[PDB]
Write an enzyme that holds these catalytic residues in place. Structure first.
Site, PDB file in Angstrom:
ATOM      1  N   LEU A   1       0.658  -0.860  -0.140  1.00 17.65           N
ATOM      2  CA  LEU A   1      -0.002  -0.154  -0.241  1.00 17.65           C
ATOM      3  C   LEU A   1       1.021   1.067   0.081  1.00 17.65           C
ATOM      4  O   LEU A   1       0.446   2.324  -0.666  1.00 17.65           O
ATOM      5  CB  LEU A   1      -1.165   0.390   1.367  1.00 17.65           C
ATOM      6  CG  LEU A   1      -1.756  -0.900   1.418  1.00 17.65           C
ATOM      7  CD1 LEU A   1      -2.588  -0.927   2.857  1.00 17.65           C
ATOM      8  CD2 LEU A   1      -3.027  -1.265   0.213  1.00 17.65           C
TER       9      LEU A   1
ATOM     10  N   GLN B   1       6.779   7.155   7.678  1.00 22.18           N
ATOM     11  CA  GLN B   1       7.873   7.426   8.897  1.00 22.18           C
ATOM     12  C   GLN B   1       8.351   6.134   9.498  1.00 22.18           C
ATOM     13  O   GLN B   1       9.108   6.006  10.264  1.00 22.18           O
ATOM     14  CB  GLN B   1       7.206   8.123   9.890  1.00 22.18           C
ATOM     15  CG  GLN B   1       8.551   8.844  10.724  1.00 22.18           C
ATOM     16  CD  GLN B   1       7.474   9.637  11.526  1.00 22.18           C
ATOM     17  OE1 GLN B   1       5.939  10.380  11.362  1.00 22.18           O
ATOM     18  NE2 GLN B   1       8.175  10.131  12.480  1.00 22.18           N
TER      19      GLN B   1
ATOM     20  N   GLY C   1       7.455   2.523   8.408  1.00 19.50           N
ATOM     21  CA  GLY C   1       7.489   1.860   7.086  1.00 19.50           C
ATOM     22  C   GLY C   1       6.691   1.568   6.267  1.00 19.50           C
ATOM     23  O   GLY C   1       5.880   2.246   5.941  1.00 19.50           O
TER      24      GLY C   1
ATOM     25  N   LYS D   1       1.917  -2.697   9.270  1.00 20.50           N
ATOM     26  CA  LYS D   1       3.200  -2.128   9.370  1.00 20.50           C
ATOM     27  C   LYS D   1       4.271  -3.167  10.085  1.00 20.50           C
ATOM     28  O   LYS D   1       4.198  -3.604  10.883  1.00 20.50           O
ATOM     29  CB  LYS D   1       2.378  -0.816  10.362  1.00 20.50           C
ATOM     30  CG  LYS D   1       3.996  -0.073   9.486  1.00 20.50           C
ATOM     31  CD  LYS D   1       3.386   1.535   9.860  1.00 20.50           C
ATOM     32  CE  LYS D   1       2.698   2.039   9.517  1.00 20.50           C
ATOM     33  NZ  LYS D   1       2.293   3.835   9.477  1.00 20.50           N
TER      34      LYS D   1
ATOM     35  N   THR E   1      -3.546  -3.894  12.132  1.00 24.85           N
ATOM     36  CA  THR E   1      -4.762  -2.987  12.150  1.00 24.85           C
ATOM     37  C   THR E   1      -5.908  -3.147  11.106  1.00 24.85           C
ATOM     38  O   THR E   1      -4.954  -3.989  10.189  1.00 24.85           O
ATOM     39  CB  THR E   1      -4.178  -1.741  12.027  1.00 24.85           C
ATOM     40  OG1 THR E   1      -4.292  -1.033  10.839  1.00 24.85           O
ATOM     41  CG2 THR E   1      -3.341  -1.589  12.965  1.00 24.85           C
TER      42      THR E   1
ATOM     43  N   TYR F   1      -7.956  -2.801   8.275  1.00 24.65           N
ATOM     44  CA  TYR F   1      -7.453  -2.333   6.968  1.00 24.65           C
ATOM     45  C   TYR F   1      -8.662  -0.515   6.600  1.00 24.65           C
ATOM     46  O   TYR F   1     -10.242  -1.450   6.128  1.00 24.65           O
ATOM     47  CB  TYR F   1      -8.004  -3.727   5.850  1.00 24.65           C
ATOM     48  CG  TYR F   1      -7.904  -3.201   4.409  1.00 24.65           C
ATOM     49  CD1 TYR F   1      -6.737  -2.492   4.191  1.00 24.65           C
ATOM     50  CD2 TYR F   1      -8.672  -3.185   3.555  1.00 24.65           C
ATOM     51  CE1 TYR F   1      -6.345  -2.215   2.606  1.00 24.65           C
ATOM     52  CE2 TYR F   1      -8.600  -2.812   2.180  1.00 24.65           C
ATOM     53  CZ  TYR F   1      -7.593  -2.518   1.739  1.00 24.65           C
ATOM     54  OH  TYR F   1      -7.478  -1.844   0.571  1.00 24.65           O
TER      55      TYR F   1
ATOM     56  N   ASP G   1      -0.823  14.176  18.484  1.00 23.48           N
ATOM     57  CA  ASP G   1      -0.533  13.862  16.622  1.00 23.48           C
ATOM     58  C   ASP G   1      -1.530  14.115  16.032  1.00 23.48           C
ATOM     59  O   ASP G   1      -1.971  13.703  14.350  1.00 23.48           O
ATOM     60  CB  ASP G   1       0.745  13.730  15.786  1.00 23.48           C
ATOM     61  CG  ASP G   1       1.310  14.382  14.527  1.00 23.48           C
ATOM     62  OD1 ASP G   1       1.230  14.781  14.154  1.00 23.48           O
ATOM     63  OD2 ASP G   1       1.908  13.268  14.111  1.00 23.48           O
TER      64      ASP G   1
ATOM     65  N   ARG H   1      -3.372  14.009   7.829  1.00 18.84           N
ATOM     66  CA  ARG H   1      -2.409  12.809   7.506  1.00 18.84           C
ATOM     67  C   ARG H   1      -2.224  11.586   8.486  1.00 18.84           C
ATOM     68  O   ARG H   1      -2.334  10.493   8.340  1.00 18.84           O
ATOM     69  CB  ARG H   1      -0.654  13.234   7.323  1.00 18.84           C
ATOM     70  CG  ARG H   1      -0.380  14.164   8.717  1.00 18.84           C
ATOM     71  CD  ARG H   1       1.335  14.359   9.076  1.00 18.84           C
ATOM     72  NE  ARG H   1       1.276  15.084   9.947  1.00 18.84           N
ATOM     73  CZ  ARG H   1       1.092  16.047  10.753  1.00 18.84           C
ATOM     74  NH1 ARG H   1       0.258  16.733   9.865  1.00 18.84           N
ATOM     75  NH2 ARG H   1       1.171  16.590  12.214  1.00 18.84           N
ATOM     76  N   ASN H   2      -2.929  11.944   9.406  1.00 16.68           N
ATOM     77  CA  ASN H   2      -2.673  10.721  11.053  1.00 16.68           C
ATOM     78  C   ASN H   2      -4.514  10.045  10.745  1.00 16.68           C
ATOM     79  O   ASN H   2      -4.355   9.453  12.177  1.00 16.68           O
ATOM     80  CB  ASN H   2      -2.678  10.790  12.469  1.00 16.68           C
ATOM     81  CG  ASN H   2      -0.850  10.913  12.206  1.00 16.68           C
ATOM     82  OD1 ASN H   2      -0.134  10.376  11.467  1.00 16.68           O
ATOM     83  ND2 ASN H   2      -0.567  12.366  12.735  1.00 16.68           N
TER      84      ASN H   2
ATOM     85  N   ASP I   1      -2.972   5.792  15.053  1.00  9.34           N
ATOM     86  CA  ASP I   1      -1.990   6.120  15.627  1.00  9.34           C
ATOM     87  C   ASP I   1      -1.808   7.093  16.610  1.00  9.34           C
ATOM     88  O   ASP I   1      -1.403   8.091  17.084  1.00  9.34           O
ATOM     89  CB  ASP I   1      -0.684   6.745  14.470  1.00  9.34           C
ATOM     90  CG  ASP I   1       0.065   6.359  13.305  1.00  9.34           C
ATOM     91  OD1 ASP I   1      -0.866   4.903  12.664  1.00  9.34           O
ATOM     92  OD2 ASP I   1       0.661   6.412  12.800  1.00  9.34           O
TER      93      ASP I   1
ATOM     94  N   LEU J   1       0.938   7.247  19.154  1.00 12.66           N
ATOM     95  CA  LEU J   1       1.943   6.689  19.303  1.00 12.66           C
ATOM     96  C   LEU J   1       3.778   8.242  18.814  1.00 12.66           C
ATOM     97  O   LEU J   1       4.257   7.169  19.894  1.00 12.66           O
ATOM     98  CB  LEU J   1       2.120   6.621  17.583  1.00 12.66           C
ATOM     99  CG  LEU J   1       3.123   5.666  16.573  1.00 12.66           C
ATOM    100  CD1 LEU J   1       4.113   4.956  17.540  1.00 12.66           C
ATOM    101  CD2 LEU J   1       2.587   5.577  15.327  1.00 12.66           C
TER     102      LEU J   1
HETATM  103  C1  LIG Z   1      -4.241   2.232  15.134  1.00  9.67           C
HETATM  104  O1  LIG Z   1      -2.967   2.233  14.820  1.00  9.67           O
HETATM  105  C2  LIG Z   1      -1.895   2.037  15.500  1.00  9.67           C
HETATM  106  C3  LIG Z   1      -2.811   2.606  16.720  1.00  9.67           C
HETATM  107  C4  LIG Z   1      -2.072   3.005  18.058  1.00  9.67           C
HETATM  108  C5  LIG Z   1      -0.577   3.183  17.840  1.00  9.67           C
HETATM  109  F1  LIG Z   1       0.347   4.298  18.600  1.00  9.67           F
HETATM  110  C6  LIG Z   1       0.157   2.970  16.625  1.00  9.67           C
HETATM  111  C7  LIG Z   1      -0.917   2.454  15.547  1.00  9.67           C
HETATM  112  C8  LIG Z   1       0.011   1.885  14.570  1.00  9.67           C
HETATM  113  O2  LIG Z   1       1.342   2.002  14.593  1.00  9.67           O
HETATM  114  N1  LIG Z   1      -0.477   1.040  13.009  1.00  9.67           N
HETATM  115  C9  LIG Z   1       0.087   0.570  11.969  1.00  9.67           C
HETATM  116  C10 LIG Z   1      -0.627   1.219  11.038  1.00  9.67           C
HETATM  117  C11 LIG Z   1      -0.886   2.663  10.115  1.00  9.67           C
HETATM  118  C12 LIG Z   1      -1.760   2.476   9.770  1.00  9.67           C
HETATM  119  C13 LIG Z   1      -1.800   2.156   8.574  1.00  9.67           C
HETATM  120  C14 LIG Z   1      -2.693   2.543   6.868  1.00  9.67           C
HETATM  121  N2  LIG Z   1      -1.929   3.506   6.158  1.00  9.67           N
HETATM  122  N3  LIG Z   1      -2.219   3.624   5.486  1.00  9.67           N
HETATM  123  C15 LIG Z   1      -1.752   4.383   4.091  1.00  9.67           C
HETATM  124  C16 LIG Z   1      -1.044   5.270   4.657  1.00  9.67           C
HETATM  125  C17 LIG Z   1      -0.379   3.263   4.260  1.00  9.67           C
HETATM  126  F2  LIG Z   1      -0.008   4.339   2.752  1.00  9.67           F
HETATM  127  F3  LIG Z   1       0.996   3.251   4.486  1.00  9.67           F
HETATM  128  F4  LIG Z   1      -0.722   2.510   3.579  1.00  9.67           F
HETATM  129  C18 LIG Z   1      -2.944   2.707   5.426  1.00  9.67           C
HETATM  130  N4  LIG Z   1      -4.097   2.987   4.094  1.00  9.67           N
HETATM  131  C19 LIG Z   1      -3.676   1.783   6.383  1.00  9.67           C
HETATM  132  C20 LIG Z   1      -4.425   0.640   6.825  1.00  9.67           C
HETATM  133  N5  LIG Z   1      -4.698   0.343   8.154  1.00  9.67           N
HETATM  134  O3  LIG Z   1      -5.592   0.345   5.979  1.00  9.67           O
HETATM  135  C21 LIG Z   1      -1.555   0.458   8.958  1.00  9.67           C
HETATM  136  C22 LIG Z   1      -1.067   0.115  10.605  1.00  9.67           C
END
Ligand SMILES: COc1ccc(F)cc1C(=O)NCc1ccc(-c2nn([C@@H](C)C(F)(F)F)c(N)c2C(N)=O)cc1
Length: 263
Positions: A14, A18, A20, A36, A80, A82, A127, A131-132, A145, A148
């Site tokens: 995907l 920052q 991973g 992630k 997490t 999706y 934060d 973007r979050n 996040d 985080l």
């Molecule tokens: C709820 O999560 C948390 C709550 C508290 C905390 F302290 C940490 C975390 C954490 O680290 N989560 C890991 C994570 C974060 C974002 C994506 C994600 N990102 N994206 C996009 C931008 C991309 F481009 F990166 F793929 C999705 N569509 C994603 C999707 N879930 O479909 C995937 C896993």
């Protein structure tokens, strides 16, 4: 809290950021998940893993759920819910040529509901920004996040004087004293409403971070995006009182948002 990597199937990359690389996959061949793969040296991994269960307990329909972690290999994986439409920031920019103004207010309500739940647990996001936030296949916005930044190793991002700190989303007491509270999350929510109503424009775009911090300390604020009505702008502007104790709670913002929706 510990997910066995044998139960994961990886299907599509995907993106990367920052913390991973993110992949879409399935758990036990059936349930959609995002995975992630944490970038080495980006996080306090031992501390995150001992507290992954705390974040897993924060269950609200408008929070992106944390399902668990895989920690018996390198890199660690964070699993997490999706969110097929990805980051809210990018989704707003794509919405620019296809939207109803009513949908922008419903995005603010979704984020406000998540934040009223975090406030009810005295859990700080730290934060909050477009973007979050992430967007699912049905267009529902959810907050991600949460908490985080407490585990991030790079001081460039966590310190108020770091080049990568979210200055544009921070109130005066955070920029000057690093004083975080539910009221600094309220300030950031008002900036996030401005990002939604501006379809993803950068706040204070004519200014550098240093100039933005001075601008805010001098009492200057973001103007009204043309898509926001005066009632909507009054809500976002209420998040920006210089004195933190004069800012509303998320329960009050939610009621104000629901009033604008009703009328
Ligand atoms: C709820 O999560 C948390 C709550 C508290 C905390 F302290 C940490 C975390 C954490 O680290 N989560 C890991 C994570 C974060 C974002 C994506 C994600 N990102 N994206 C996009 C931008 C991309 F481009 F990166 F793929 C999705 N569509 C994603 C999707 N879930 O479909 C995937 C896993």
């Amino acid at each position: 809290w510990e997910i066995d990597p044998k139960d994961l199937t990886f299907l599509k990359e995907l993106g990367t950021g920052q913390f991973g690389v993110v992949k879409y996959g399935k758990w036990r061949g059936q349930y959609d998940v995002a995975i992630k793969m944490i970038k080495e040296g980006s996080m306090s991994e031992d501390e995150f893993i001992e507290e992954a269960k705390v974040m897993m307990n924060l269950s609200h329909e408008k929070l992106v759920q944390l399902y668990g972690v895989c920690t018996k290999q390198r890199p660690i994986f964070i699993i997490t819910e999706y969110m097929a439409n990805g980051s809210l920031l990018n989704y707003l920019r794509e919405m620019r040529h296809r939207f109803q103004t009513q949908q922008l207010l419903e995005m603010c309500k979704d984020v406000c509901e998540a934040m009223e739940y975090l406030e009810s647990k005295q859990f700080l996001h730290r934060d909050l920004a477009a973007r979050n936030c992430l967007v699912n296949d049905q267009g529902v916005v959810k907050v991600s996040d949460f908490g985080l930044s407490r585990y991030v190793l790079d001081d460039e991002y966590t310190s108020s004087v770091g080049s990568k700190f979210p200055v544009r989303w921070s109130p005066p007491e955070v920029l000057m004293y690093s004083k975080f509270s539910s009221k600094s999350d309220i300030w950031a929510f008002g900036v996030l409403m401005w990002e939604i109503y501006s379809l993803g424009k950068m706040p204070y775009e004519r200014f550098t971070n240093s100039e933005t911090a001075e601008h805010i300390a001098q009492g200057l604020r973001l103007y009204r995006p043309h898509l926001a009505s005066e009632k909507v702008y009054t809500i976002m502007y209420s998040c920006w009182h210089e004195k933190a104790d004069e800012r509303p709670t998320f329960k009050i913002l939610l009621s104000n948002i629901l009033d604008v929706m009703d009328e």
